[PDB]
Write a protein that binds this ligand. Structure first.
Ligand SMILES: [Mg+2]
Ligand SMILES: [Mg+2]
Ligand SMILES: [Mg+2]
Ligand SMILES: [Mg+2]
Ligand SMILES: [Mg+2]
Ligand SMILES: [Mg+2]
Ligand SMILES: [Mg+2]
Ligand SMILES: [Mg+2]
Ligand SMILES: [Mg+2]
Ligand SMILES: [Mg+2]
Ligand SMILES: [Mg+2]
Ligand SMILES: [Mg+2]
Ligand SMILES: [Mg+2]
Ligand SMILES: [Mg+2]
Ligand SMILES: [Mg+2]
Ligand SMILES: [Mg+2]
Ligand SMILES: [Mg+2]
Ligand SMILES: [Mg+2]
Ligand SMILES: [Mg+2]
Ligand SMILES: [Mg+2]
Ligand SMILES: [Mg+2]
Ligand SMILES: [Mg+2]
Ligand SMILES: [Mg+2]
Ligand SMILES: [Mg+2]
Lengths: 210, 102, 147
RNA sequence: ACGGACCAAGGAGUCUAACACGUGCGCGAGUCGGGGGCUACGAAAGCCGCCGUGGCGCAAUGAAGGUGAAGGCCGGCGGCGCGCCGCCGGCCGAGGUGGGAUCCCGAGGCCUUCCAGUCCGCCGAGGGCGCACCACCGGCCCGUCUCGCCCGCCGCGCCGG
RNA sequence: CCCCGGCGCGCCGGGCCCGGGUCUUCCCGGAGUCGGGUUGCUUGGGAAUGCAGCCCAAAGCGGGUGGUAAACUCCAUCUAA
RNA sequence: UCAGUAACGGCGAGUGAACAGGGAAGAGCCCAGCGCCGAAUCCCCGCCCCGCGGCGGGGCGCGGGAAAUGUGGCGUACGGA
């Protein structure tokens, strides 16, 4: 029996909800447990970063988000082939690799190849045997100075380029933005209809000539 | 007249150049290999044809293409698979006609 | 605070604030939204109009990401860019108009609602309004489209 | 008419979610770390801002494709029959009427021996800017209906305004 | 003061004779399965989301998906049994 | 968080996700097929050495079986030989 004025409402409590009530009193204990597991992993891998391997500069799908840049699953095989790193060497030297990704854009391809070139320079590779170093190993001065990096290694920042104040030209003054938008809407709506009418008019012209 | 990159229209989207890379190797599944064609025509020679396929061959011999398409569509389901089976039966009917002629 | 609630003052009173003639029974008029067409017709007519029935097309798999188009007005267009840009645009004698990137600020469409100060702009947005274009061209400025 | 021998103890509008209204506090076109991470009581507390992602609010409307919230005046030119429409340069540039708490101006006077006579207050005829709010008249955006005239081209059209 | 496990060092017995780039020549896929009709249950899934019973029953530049059933046409994206 | 939203429902009562974004965590792979290698493979029993309270490693057996109706190595959609 509703009273004078109020919102219509649909409470979803018609099931037996009191059996399945997830209480959240485990929350600070789980924060302590995640903290101890993370410190245990950081003490387990002693020179390696506590976060993990590096993750790609990634454009977002689904037009709400495509201006933003994320950290992705892993590097692409074409990215590794251009940078010159084998995909099984990359997992051993601490590089996220996934074979599912493609490379349609050239700019993001070059950006991830450049990020590989920066990470190969920033990487300090320790030798397998300390008594007998190999050809592709770091120097003894870098062996002592190498340490962990707290947080995400090379944190991806959404950079925006800075433009300067320009003088407005007569073509920019004479450009019609809303009219161009409406003409583009009309052409994208009527692209197939004009082509069908052109084919039908060509058929009428062939029927008139022949 | 300048043409700004528009989010809507016939050529919408942000202007990004496209590279020409090697296509994926998972895309070529179902490609007709010569050895698989040999195995396939081999077993077509050994086992023979199905009864509904023989009935559709008879419907193509009596020149009823629409009724043959309706029968193959009722037997196999979709119209695309029906048209492919009708073209395959017409091809093997032309092959049998050429073998009977010369 | 149970000492501030109403159950403290009603101790001693028999019907407990729920009436002596008509008792506080469990569900006298049904549960929830019971009888909105039959015996609660007047309440839903006077307070929830249009509640019953269907209208419009059934868009099956709707996408709020596709429906995403945030708007910003020309009245608070200068809140997106810092104030020293406005100072330098008012100070420059040559006429170097500042570029306001609306997609960088986080809006797609620019609508023209309020007064714009008399200095040229270069508004780079995804969509534009006709009134917004008229205000920008009347003040001075350009409307650059971007995808 | 029903319940009731008597006495002691227990005993009945609680809790969660959602919504509405009122009040208190903080910030304010912003607000919020609730999820995550870092540093006995302490499972607390403090911190994060390139962890404000995200919710709500700042823009509504249409079933949807979509669209999306003041104008006036001067000069020049083109068209049509001093008047109207369209295109460029400067100015005024955010509606009005009535009721409106408060504020502003001050015709005059506020007494000790008569006149002249400066400053601080104080009250007020009458006239104003008018807070909020109310009632109305206007104006703008959106869907729909009617009457007609013009503008634009990367694609002259069953185009767009 | 005992017991246990782990990080390392030194020795013995073994397995193993192991990579990358360029060019040429070959090869490459899971069948009463997919899918279609019908029925029953289920799902927010609505001309049938998923599963199951019966009947039909595949193909290889093929097949599945692209939230309205269908035909034509280009695309996008995966490789089921 | 999307979101009590799209959607389902005598469209009534009521029911009701998914994508994406921010995080905790993050790890990838192996066969059949297709093919190359004298079955190059596996199990059990006899003897010797070590160790034997998770019955394991090596050598010696014209010892017994499994397996060509296919065991092992290279190799699996990220191509492979
Ligand atoms: Mg009541
Ligand atoms: Mg993490
Ligand atoms: Mg009383
Ligand atoms: Mg009572
Ligand atoms: Mg009461
Ligand atoms: Mg009475
Ligand atoms: Mg009552
Ligand atoms: Mg009640
Ligand atoms: Mg009735
Ligand atoms: Mg009696
Ligand atoms: Mg009684
Ligand atoms: Mg009695
Ligand atoms: Mg008592
Ligand atoms: Mg109420
Ligand atoms: Mg309140
Ligand atoms: Mg059942
Ligand atoms: Mg059901
Ligand atoms: Mg299609
Ligand atoms: Mg919400
Ligand atoms: Mg009804
Ligand atoms: Mg249910
Ligand atoms: Mg997600
Ligand atoms: Mg084999
Ligand atoms: Mg796979």
């Amino acid at each position: 029996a509703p009273s004078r004025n109020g919102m219509i409402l649909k409470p979803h409590f018609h099931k037996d909800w009191q059996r399945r009530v997830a209480t959240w009193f485990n929350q600070p204990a789980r924060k302590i447990r995640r903290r101890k597991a993370r410190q245990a992993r950081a003490r387990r891998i002693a020179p390696r970063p506590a976060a993990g391997p590096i993750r790609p500069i990634v454009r977002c799908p689904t037009v709400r988000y495509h201006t933003k840049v994320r950290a992705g699953r892993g590097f692409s095989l074409e990215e590794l082939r251009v940078a010159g790193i084998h995909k099984k060497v990359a997992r051993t030297i601490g590089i996220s690799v996934d074979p599912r990704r493609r490379n349609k854009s050239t700019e993001s391809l070059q950006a991830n190849v450049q990020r590989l070139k920066e990470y190969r320079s920033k990487l300090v590779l320790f030798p397998r045997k300390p008594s007998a170093p190999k050809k592709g190993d770091s120097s003894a001065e870098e062996l002592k100075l190498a340490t962990q990096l707290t947080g995400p290694v090379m944190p991806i920042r959404n950079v925006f380029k800075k433009e300067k104040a320009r003088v407005i030209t007569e073509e920019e003054k004479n450009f019609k933005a809303f009219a161009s938008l409406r003409m583009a809407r009309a052409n994208a709506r009527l692209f197939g209809i004009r082509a069908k009418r052109a084919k039908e008019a060509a058929e009428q012209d062939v029927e008139k000539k022949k | 007249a300048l043409r700004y990159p528009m989010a809507v229209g016939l050529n919408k989207g942000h202007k990004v150049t496209k590279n020409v890379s090697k296509p994926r190797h998972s895309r070529r599944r179902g490609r007709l290999t010569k050895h698989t064609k040999f195995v396939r025509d081999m077993i077509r020679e050994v086992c023979g044809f199905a009864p509904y396929e023989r009935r559709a061959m008879e419907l193509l011999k009596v020149s009823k293409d629409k009724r043959a398409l309706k029968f193959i569509k009722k037997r196999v389901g979709t119209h695309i698979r029906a048209k492919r089976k009708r073209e395959e039966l017409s091809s093997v009917l032309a092959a049998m006609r050429k073998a009977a002629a010369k | 605070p149970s000492r501030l609630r109403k159950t403290r003052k009603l101790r001693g009173h028999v019907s407990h604030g729920h009436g002596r003639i008509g008792k506080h029974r469990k569900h006298p008029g049904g549960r929830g939204n019971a009888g909105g067409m039959h015996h609660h017709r007047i309440n839903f007519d006077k307070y929830h109009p249009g509640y019953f029935g269907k209208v419009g097309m059934r868009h099956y798999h709707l996408k709020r990401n596709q429906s995403f188009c945030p708007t910003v007005n020309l009245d608070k267009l200068w809140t997106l860019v810092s104030e020293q840009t406005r100072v330098n645009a008012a100070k420059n004698k040559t006429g170097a108009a500042p570029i306001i990137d609306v997609v960088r600020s986080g809006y797609y469409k620019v609508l023209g609602k309020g007064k714009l100060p008399k200095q040229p702009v270069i508004v780079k947005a995804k969509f534009f309004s006709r009134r917004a274009e008229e205000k920008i061209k009347g003040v001075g400025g350009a409307c650059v489209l971007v995808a």
